[PDB]
Each structure stands twice: as structure tokens, then as C-alpha cells.
Structure 1
Amino acid sequence: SQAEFEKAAEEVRHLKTKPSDEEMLFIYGHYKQATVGDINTERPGMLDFTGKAKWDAWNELKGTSKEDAMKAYINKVEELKKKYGI
């Protein structure tokens, strides 16, 4: 639900240990897919590697519905809370 999505977006900021870059990109990609939906931008160029990594994570989810990305985002945050603590 929307209230669960809001709770998860808050709780993920409070993990006691920083998740891996892969976990952080799962969170970023699904957050975008659950809100904007399919990627609507061009991949960052030049030396913006942080931007390219985020873009690639969101691009891989093209086709996923907002509702399914939201559910996966919430589930991942709950997984991260159990893994790292809050």
C-alpha cells in the first residue's frame, strides 16, 4: 500500500549498517519504478559513474508495473531491516 511505501522509504534511511551498493541500487531502482514508472531519461554520460549505476538499475526494471515495484521495494526494505537492524 501507499502507507507501507512511505514507511519503508523512511525506515530504509535508518538502517544501522550501510547496505551493499547492489542493495542500495535495488532500493533506488524500485523507488523510481514505483513512482515515475518506466525510465524516461537518457543514461548519464561522461564520468558520472554514480549516475550511470543508478540509471542502469532503474532501466533494468522497464516494463514492471508501479504496484509490483512498490511491493518489491517494501519487501526489500523489510529484508534489510532484519539483516542490518533499525
Structure 2
Amino acid sequence: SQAEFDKAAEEVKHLKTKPADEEMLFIYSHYKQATVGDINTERPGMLDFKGKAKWDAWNELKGTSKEDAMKAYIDKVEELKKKYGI
């Protein structure tokens, strides 16, 4: 059906600690691409400060091989799972 990806996701979005913007970004961007696809949300407007980046990082992908997005997402999440975990 699926791999460990939604798992990676599921875990990461809960984590004891809330990952740094970039950690969240990688995850986010890739998940969003692997799942939703091509940043179809749009770039921020009000308290942009800690949002933009997520937008941009996902955007940066906008068309990556979804599968890769998953692989990568998990393949990298490990760090979060080792640093933050549930």
C-alpha cells in the first residue's frame, strides 16, 4: 500500500521536541510533494516570519518524483527520530 513514509510523517509531526525550521522544512516540503504534490497552497501573507521557509522549501520541489520525496522524507526523518522522536 504505502512504505514507512506516512509513518515518518505521523511521527515527525508529533515529536517530543519541535524540529528546527530546516528539519521541519525538509520533512514538510518532501512530504507535501510526495503526498499532495506541487505546492498548491501558496506563499505566506501575515506573520510570514516562521512560515515562508516551509512554503519555499516545499515549493523548491514542485515537481519532484513523489516516490523520491517519500524515500528522502523517511531516509532523512531518521535524524528527527534520533533527535526528537515520539
TM-score, normalized by the shorter chain, greater than 0.5: yes
Higher CA-based Rg: 1
Query: Residues 84, 47 of structure 1: CA spacing in aligned structure 2 closer, same or farther, 3 A cutoff?
Result: closer
Q: Give the structure with the larger helix fraction.
A: 1
Query: Residues 48, 2 of structure 1: CA spacing in aligned structure 2 closer, same or farther, 3 A cutoff?
Result: same
User: Which 4+ runs in 1 deviate beyond 6 A?
Assistant: none
The share of aligned pairs that are identical, in percent, is: 93
User: Cα RMSD (Å) of the superposition?
Assistant: 2.2
TM norm structure 2: 0.77
Is the counterpart of residue 41 in structure 1 residue 52 in structure 2?
A: no
Task: Name the count of aligned residue pairs.
Answer: 86
TM norm structure 1: 0.77
2:13 is paired with a residue whose SS is helix
Q: Which consecutive unaligned segments of at least 5 residues does structure 2 have?
A: none
Q: Which consecutive unaligned segments of at least 5 residues does structure 1 have?
A: none
1:75 shift after superposition: 1.1
